[model samples]
Target: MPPSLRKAVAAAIGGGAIAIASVLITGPSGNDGLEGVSYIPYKDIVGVWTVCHGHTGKDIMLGKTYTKAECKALLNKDLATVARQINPYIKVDIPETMRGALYSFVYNVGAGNFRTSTLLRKINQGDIKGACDQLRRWTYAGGKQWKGLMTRREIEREICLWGQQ
Candidate 1:
């Protein structure tokens, strides 16, 4: 792997091995497409209190601050879950960078969307450019134009097409 790809892999999977059959890719890295995204220790965006990369559940609570290490730990855990969900659906070989980009996409959109996504279909069919085009259409969330999601999707599209160019 090249230096940047190695760095991206490091940032994504964070030193842990998440085996996904023949994919040969780690989970999405925090530095890859998730850069500049702040870790809100007390966020209530979707009508529930969330912390550290929109993480919520039994452990998260309001006004509870988490260290950067904790945030990274949570991110890795979440990415692992996403990888599990996406891996089984993929039927074709893809580069590690594209795997990372798909990880970010599934992380943002949830497994349900990816389970039925046209993007995944395109990828399984080896239509990489078509898959890249699908990334742009996912900028909307909850019936609104979210600039952050738009920006993330744009970066993901670039990452999805990193080698093809």
Candidate 2:
């Protein structure tokens, strides 16, 4: 293998399982951020039918109601995919609190958005303050600013900065 490739592989291997593990699955912050059920779309980005912690899939049908347990299960499944997408892009160490915050952010926005975000850029640059501030810029939906997204961004910023702010 090429020397740079070999070195990069070694570094990733050295990072420990928690570094590689999916973002914390036990945090209530992410759950709280996405809580609620709607048999129909309420938010601009959401469509058709969504239920239980932002769970939306082709399998879901309109007028179907989901139990709390089912919603929790679906949340886990959704978060699993979010973790996979966001985890690979983090090139720096971050606190569990910040990780949970970012998980909720990514879960709400999207991996593509996160990947291209100034928030992610600031984080990788080790500018925690800048990253936290960047969260406030993401409160738009359906081509206009949204109060719900604004509230969510504020909570995420508080959590991401934690004691640093």
Candidate 3:
């Protein structure tokens, strides 16, 4: 393996960041007081049906409902999977806060977007501070700027930059 690739492997996160990130990605606590996931599936900001802490899958049907217990369980599974999806992209060791911020970002935007992003490139090039700044540029949904996205990014940016000062 390339020494560069080896470095990311060594810096990989386990489930620690998942706890912080999952709260940020799905809650009334984060995302600018956005509504927490509903028991019943509903169209999200871009009209994709979502439920159970942002859970979206072919298994979800619009008329269905989940118990809070089920939603929490789904959240756990979702965060773990998202962590696996995002971790390999981080090319350097980062603070847990920063890792959590990136996890929320990837949760919102999707891993495919992160894979092709300048944010990821900056991180890989060792410009982590710049990569944190990049979170502010993602305040859009459905081709329009969302105040909610903007506010969420601001919070995540702060998380991303934690311990830098």
Candidate 4:
């Protein structure tokens, strides 16, 4: 990274500003009031997904640079709760396959991105199988597919194929 870009990122991280999701780096809580109870597993889920999906470091991908602990704090933050915060009537009826896929997707992209996805639209339209097929199409990010991305995609596909318990 160049000096200027490095400095900009440093300032962003230090200032605790949210580029998109209003990330609370050092605020009262990183939850942003979208939920009351924090879901620790979600953070882990995201961490695993990012390492698998985008090869991101431990640092929070978007707003706040969350630690393993901080990301874990997000697991219990239900999708509906997050949806409501984003949109009062944003319905989040996640199916078995969609839930796992959405869980991974939301962990990496945050709640807003998932809600706006065509996969969600397919699910809402009652195209469950098609939706499962949709997971593979999310095979690229930052303009390339790393080895980890392929592996994670397969994992998500299997989960999509087999209903989660």
Candidate 5:
């Protein structure tokens, strides 16, 4: 990939343009093309309080609403945090696409899981492609299969392979 294209990919991921909130396509609330970000808090499939483009946890309020500006700020803030939470485990230098792929994976799957993952071990062991392949195995939620997660993993897996040697 060209240098410019690589940077564009990184910028897109850093700005919350991929994964979790990926395409603003559609939502479960009969809201079409809103998968990108929701200004209001909601309980996700697992009953966790989530809001603002998949930003969740104690900071989220079950009844609060956010302005578009507020939501974007929160998303951006958390995206950086996702990277911070997992960057240390990557024992090898990687391209922007690979790094971006990791940001998306860690964001949806949580940092703690990555900290203890075989995927992390694969990367540290210099098994880069194998680590990316592990993204596909995470298609389970609630200890069951979810097609949505599989789709997300496919995208992450492809992105993770971009520019690999």
Candidate 6:
């Protein structure tokens, strides 16, 4: 096999291993799409995330700010773009509700972070519940041990571990 092909195969297999491990570590959520968080319009959250992610929303919310054509192009133009970047290497395969939930997680943590998350690893393995459980574990952005972070982590972890249920 060619070098790139070899690399792809290795990544696929490796991703599979990570995914499998993630499943064992977590579980699955019942609701599809995004779960847990209430919707507040894509527009409302766009600027907030732009600022939260360290961008000033000066440059459009995608492309230059992030790392994906769809995001750069502002395809969905909402929270989904954040999550889409999280698992750019592997397909996320979540529904709309889950999309929002996952996007929020990615936005708070950043795609670079979600990329390394066990939650994403589970998704790569095709273990949705387990992936959701992993999400719950990632609620700390600031250095403070704020209760907000704890609650957010639980909520996100719940989504990863159980989805809607």
Compose the digit string of candidate 1's lDDT tens values, residues 1-165. Answer: 345644555454433333221112222343333433335555565676666655667777556567767766776687788788889898988776677778767766789999898998898999989988899889887889889877767767776776687
Give the clashing pairs for model 1: 11-29, 12-28, 12-29
- What ranking emerges by TM-score with the best candidate at the front? 3, 5, 1, 2, 6, 4
lDDT of 2 at 49: 53
lDDT of each: 0.66, 0.64, 0.74, 0.44, 0.68, 0.44
**Which portions of model 5 show Cα errors greater than 4 Å?**
1-36, 61-63
Estimate, for each residue in 1-165, the C-alpha lDDT of model 6 and write its tens digit: 134422332333334422221221122321111222211223334444342112234444432334433332332343445535654656856643344446556645668877777877777788877776675456554555656656656544543343345
Q: What TM-score would every model get versus the actual structure?
A: 0.74, 0.71, 0.79, 0.45, 0.75, 0.47
Worst 10 residues of 4 by lDDT: 17-26
Residue-by-residue lDDT tens digits, candidate 5, 21-133: 33222222323322356778888778878887777778886677787667767766786787777887777987666776777778777899999988988988889899899
Off by over 4 Å in 6: 1-55, 59-80, 141-144, 157-164
lDDT preference between candidates 3 and 4, better one:
3
Per-model clash counts, in order, read 3, 0, 0, 8, 2, 22
Top candidate by lDDT: 3
Which residue window of length 10 is worst by lDDT in model 1? Answer: 18-27
Tens digits of per-residue lDDT for model 3 on 1-165? 234322332343343577557656554333322236678888876788898778887778778778878887887787788888988878788888788778878888889999999999998898999999998899976789999888888877876786485
* Superposed Cα deviation of residue 156, candidate 4 (Å): 1.6
Give lDDT for model 5: 0.68
Best by TM-score: 3
List ranges where model 1 is wrong by over 4 Å: 1-40, 61-63
List, residue by residue over 1-165, the lDDT tens digit for candidate 2: 234422332343334322211222222232322345543433334344566666677767556566666666777678677778898899998765577668778877789999999889998999988888999999987699989788768766765765464
Query: Candidate 3, 9: how far from true, in Å?
Result: 26
**Candidates in descending lDDT order:** 3, 5, 1, 2, 6, 4
Candidate scoring better on TM-score of 3 and 4? 3
Q: After superposition, how far is residue 92 of candidate 1 from its true place, in Å?
A: 0.6
Candidate 1 vs candidate 2: the lDDT winner is 1
The residue-by-residue lDDT of candidate 4 on 2-96, one tens digit each, is: 34422333343433213112221111233322122332223444345231112334443444444545443444243334434434322545443
